[PDB]
Each structure stands twice: as structure tokens, then as C-alpha cells.
């Protein structure tokens with residue numbers, strides 16, 4: 001810990017603080033979410049059916065009393081069986097994104113940036129910081145993202161563990177979990193993703209790139225000061241590689257998402273703004289940035 | 294063979310059953326589902342731990358929603374399924390009220406004896422219908438798209454067969470009764486002269502004797518006589534066991550209601566909570 005500059009210490013101290021105050025590990029305040037109800041365009045339909053089959057999951061909504069609802073998704077047959085859990089996942093991604101917005105809103109280096117670069121940075125890193133947070137609740141053995149009450153469990157396939165790791169996002173979660181990262185390396189990862197200066201729309205490239213660098217320098221140091229075991233050799237460069245891969249996956253799933261919205265509109269109002277004057281077009285985002293935490 | 298009157302007796306009952314029993318439960322809509330004085334509270338917790346089951350809802354999409362019941366905590370949790378079973382009971386009671394009306398023998402009775410017979414026969418007729426959807430292998434009442442599965446209680450069939458009502462369903466299902474024999478049981482149960490509030494005792498007793506003789510005669514005629522020699526008596530004993538079970542669960546319901554009111558308005562009438570004035574809903578249902 002001392003091996004880190006007092007500036008670095010305070011930097012991990014602020015990031016971890018913002019994570020605790022803005023990340024709901026228990027999803028306890030995740031409420032009012034929708035649940036599954038109790039030719040050229042046809043080629044587009046065929047593409048979407050492959051996207052959704054990779055991320056087929058069952059939803060286990062546990063209850064304080066001890067009860068457990070479990071939804072087994074319908075097997076694909078015709079149309080819209082596939083879009084059954086989509087209204088829910090949209091509600092849950094918005095709840096996730098709102099905490100990512102609040103994470104950044106608490107960080108000093110982010111709070112001082114021009115509001116149009118706060119909007120643009122969050123637009124580029126919303127998925128990446130979401131997936132990084134989801135990884136912390138991912139159970140590699142069960143194949144479940146354990147989100148407090150709700151648990152999303154990967155549906156068993158015929159291809160087995162081999163068929164799953166074909167999906168880049170499922171592979172990303174399994175590889176990143178394998179690294180057994182500390183909370184500090186996750187929040188530092190989330191900050192290197194957030195402060196990416198090459199995102200579309202960022203106009204303070206220098207300030208953001210200078211900030212990103214010091215986040216990676218703090219990450220390389222923390223790994224040097226708190227991780228001397230041989231399994232963690234090249235852990236930093238492994239982490240940095242994964243972040244580059246998450247940017248690749250972020251791009252893949254910005255395309256899958258837009259295609260689904262084209263076929264079957266499902267996006268919440270805020271999610272439509274992620275996918276589109278900056279302040280004017282992103283009215284809900286601008287509002288939330290201005291609000292307190 | 295059966296007398297032509299007896300044949301017509303069965304014909305009417307089977308007709309009533311066909312018009313008033315939704316075997317797929319396809320019209321059981323809008324039911325409440327599980328969301329997501331110290332003496333009375335513990336007695337109630339004892340009552341509710343005997344018949345724990347897991348609701349399963351199956352969608353047209355092929356999705357399955359499964360409600361595992363909440364492990365007993367003796368609190369608000371224990372009453373999680375009551376708001377639902379209260380809606381199931383009402384839906385079932387309304388179909389039982391309707392069964393009785395289709396029967397000419399019941400419509401002729403005085404409107405006050407109709408209320409009394411239904412008051413004492415509603416539970417029995419409900420459980421008789423539930424048995425026709427009971428799957429003894431899977432321990433599940435298959436109510437069309439809803440399935441209620443008796444949850445393993447760690448004692449296997451031993452603990453369940455202890456509970457007189459689960460024993461009843463298993464025992465009755467082993468009798469492999471016909472649809473005609475099920476509906477005749479309902480009549481024999483409905484037209485019971487010893488029920489509280491009856492005034493035409495001889496009229497009802499005579500009617501129940503004619504339904505029972507039809508059932509006795511049906512078995513002799515339409516079943517290998519030597520093997521099913523005592524089947525009619527087996528049935529009569531179960532109707533009797535059901536009258537005893539009716540009372541136990543009529544008390545469980547009153548105890549569970551005083552601690553926490555789950556009852557729908559029609560159920561409250563059924564449990565005593567002029568006679569035609571004390572049961573105004575049920576009266577309306579009988580004259581519409």
C-alpha cells in the first residue's frame with residue numbers, strides 16, 4: 001500500500017468509495033422491473049436468433065420470505081419466444097447503467113470534465129463498465145450471475161462448456177473471473193475503460209488520455225505491491241489485454257442490440273440515448289449527471 | 294342393467310359435470326399469485342405446514358414459471374399461497390354452485406336448503422373434482438396450465454399419507470373410478486340430509502338414497518362383478534372420510550381466517566362470516 005504514491009492511494013481510495021456508494025451488489029433497489037409474462041427482413045430475423053441463443057438464461061427471483069420463482073425460457077420455435085426475457089434485461093441494464101453513471105458522477109477526475117465529454121465517455125463505456133460489474137457477480141462454476149434476489153443462470157446447451165466459450169462475451173466473463181481480481185483492480189479497470197480518450201465525441205483527448213494513463217500506472221503498481229504470487233505474472237498486461245477485448249465485444253454487442261431494436265423495439269428511454277447537440281439528444285443522461293448522489 | 298330412470302339420472306349428472314367443470318382450468322383467470330392470540334398463530338402454522346406444494350405455471354410460449362414455497366418462518370411467509378388458493382376455491386365453488394343448478398333434483402328444493410346443502414358439500418365436491426386431475430405418480434394436481442406438486446417433506450409418502458386429505462386423494466385415485474362414478478359421488482355428497490340447516494331431510498335423504506342405489510347398480514352392471522364386489526362400499530367409506538376431512542379443514546380455514554383474512558367474499562359466506570340474508574352472494578348465484 002505504501003509502495004503506492006499517496007496520490008495513487010487516494011485514487012484507489014476514491015474509486016473504491018465510488019464503487020461502494022454506486023454499485024448495488026444485492027440489487028435491492030432494483031424494483032419495478034418487467035418480468036416475462038406469466039424475406040430480406042427474414043434474413044435479419046435469422047441473425048437475431050443466433051445472438052439471443054448464445055445468451056439464453058433462466059431467471060431465479062428469490063424472495064425475502066424464502067420463496068423462489070424460477071422462469072425457464074421457452075425453447076425457440078417461431079417468433080417472439082426469443083424476445084421473452086428482453087423487456088426484463090432492458091430494465092436491468094438501465095438500472096445497471098444508472099449506477100455506472102453515478103460511479104463516474106462521484107469521481108473527481110470525471111466530475112470536472114466538460115459535460116459533453118462526460119456524456120460521450122459514459123456512452124462509450126456504459127457496456128464495458130456494466131459487463132465488468134456483472135463479472136463480479138458471475139459464478140463460473142454455476143454459470144450464474146448472482147444479483148442478490150435475481151439470479152441469471154446460463155441455460156445448459158448440447159455443445160456444453162465448449163459451445164459457450166465460443167461466445168466472446170461468455171468467454172470474456174470466464175477468463176476475467178479466472179484472474180481472481182481484487183475489487184481494486186476491477187474499479188481501476190472500470191476507470192481505464194471510463195476514461196478512454198478515443199471514444200466517439202470526446203473533445204478533451206489530452207485530459208482524458210492523461211487521466212487514463214495514471215489509472216493504468218496505479219493499476220500496474222497495485223499489482224506490483226499487493227500480488228507477488230507466480231500465477232499473477234503479467235496480470236497487468238493480462239488485464240490490459242482483456243480491456244482491449246472488452247472494447248471489441250462492446251462493439252459486437254452494440255450491433256446485436258441495434259439489430260434487435262430494429263426488429264423488435266424494446267429499449268428503455270435511457271437505453272435509446274446510449275444508442276443514437278449532445279446534451280439535447282441525451283436529455284435523460286444530462287439530467288442524471290447534474291443530479292446529486 | 295340400469296333402470297331407464299337411473300340411466301337418465303346419470304345422464305343428467307354427467308351433463309351437469311360437462312357444463313360446469315373446466316377440466317383444463319382454462320377460465321381460471323386473474324388469480325392472485327404469490328408476490329415477488331399467540332395460540333391461534335401456532336395452530337395456524339401447524340395447519341399450513343401439512344399441505345405445502347409448488348405452483349407451476351406453463352405459458353403458451355412454453356415458458357415455465359415455478360414457485361417454490363417459502364420455508365416455514367411462522368410469519369407472514371406462511372400465508373403466501375393462501376391469497377391464491379382463496380381464488381382457486383372461489384373459482385371451484387362457483388363451478389360447483391353451477392353443477393347443482395343444472396340438476397333438476399336440486400333446483401326443485403327450497404332455496405334455503407340449496408344454500409345449506411351447498412354450504413356443507415362445497416369442500417367435498419371440490420376435492421372430488423381435484424382428484425380427477427390428481428397424478429398420484431407425480432404427486433401433482435394437474436390443473437391445465439397450473440400444476441400444484443406436493444413438496445417432498447422428508448418422510449416420503451409416509452408423511453403425506455399421514456395427512457388425512459392427501460391420503461384421501463391417493464386412496465380415491467387408486468379406486469380408478471369412472472367419470473360416471475365420480476359425478477354420482479358428488480350427488481351423494483351434495484344431497485346429504487344430515488347437513489346443517491336442511492329442512493327437507495326426508496326429501497334429500499330419499500334423493501341421496503336414489504343416487505347411491507344408482508351408483509351401487511352402476512358398479513354391478515358396468516364392472517367385473519366379483520373383483521369389484523365391495524367397490525360401492527369403498528366409495529361410501531371415502532365419502533364418509535371426506536365428511537370428517539371436511540370438518541377438519543373447515544376449522545383450519547376459520548382459524549387461519551381469524552389470524553389473517555384471506556377469504557374472498559363468497560368464501561366468507563360459505564364459512565358463516567335469516568339464512569338467505571346471511572348468504573346473499575350465494576343466493577344471487579343460485580337465482581341467476
Ligand SMILES: CCC[C@H](CC)Oc1ccc(C(=O)OC)cc1NC(=O)c1nnn(-c2cc(OC)ccc2OC)c1C
Pocket residue numbers: 052055056057085086089090093094096097100126127130131134145152169253254257274
Ligand atoms: C445477466 C447479466 C449478465 C448477462 C451477461 C451474459 O447479461 C445478459 C444475459 C442474458 C441476456 C439475454 O439473452 O436476454 C436477451 C442478455 C444479457 N445482457 C444484456 O441484456 C446487456 N448487457 N449489457 N447490456 C448493455 C448495457 C448498457 O448499459 C449498461 C449499454 C449497452 C449494452 O449493450 C448490449 C445489455 C443490453
Ligand SMILES: CCC[C@H](CC)Oc1ccc(C(=O)OC)cc1NC(=O)c1nnn(-c2cc(OC)ccc2OC)c1C
Pocket residue numbers: 344345346374375378379381382383385386389415416419420423434436441458542543546563
Ligand atoms: C388445487 C390443489 C389441490 C389441493 C388438494 C388438497 O388443494 C390444495 C393444495 C395446496 C394448498 C396449500 O398449499 O395451502 C395454501 C391448499 C389446497 N387446497 C385449498 O386451499 C382448498 N381446497 N378446498 N378448499 C375449500 C373449498 C371450499 O369450496 C370449494 C370450501 C372449503 C374449503 O376448505 C375448507 C380449500 C380452501
